[PDB]
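for ur thesis appendix - General transcription factor II-I. copy paste whatever u need, i formatted it the way the template wanted (i think)
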Amino acid sequence: GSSGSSGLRKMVDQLFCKKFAEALGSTEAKAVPYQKFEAHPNDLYVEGLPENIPFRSPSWYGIPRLEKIIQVGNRIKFVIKRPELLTHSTTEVSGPSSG
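the 3d part is after this line
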């Protein structure tokens, strides 16, 4: 997590990445497996989200939606009922691959 992040989408992306990590108990940022959360929304999900606002990628969230989330991004929470689903994180990678 570095200071900057320009663009809601980006910011939001990071926001979650971070939060998501927190629950995971990591120092560095990671990619939120929206899939795992989709195939296991009862296990893997988020808390402290905005009303009338689900939990999806930032590339989906509206322009105003993002911010709204960012506003409550300080109250957001990530529950890892089953982290195993993620099955570790590291996998021979150093740097932003693809994006």
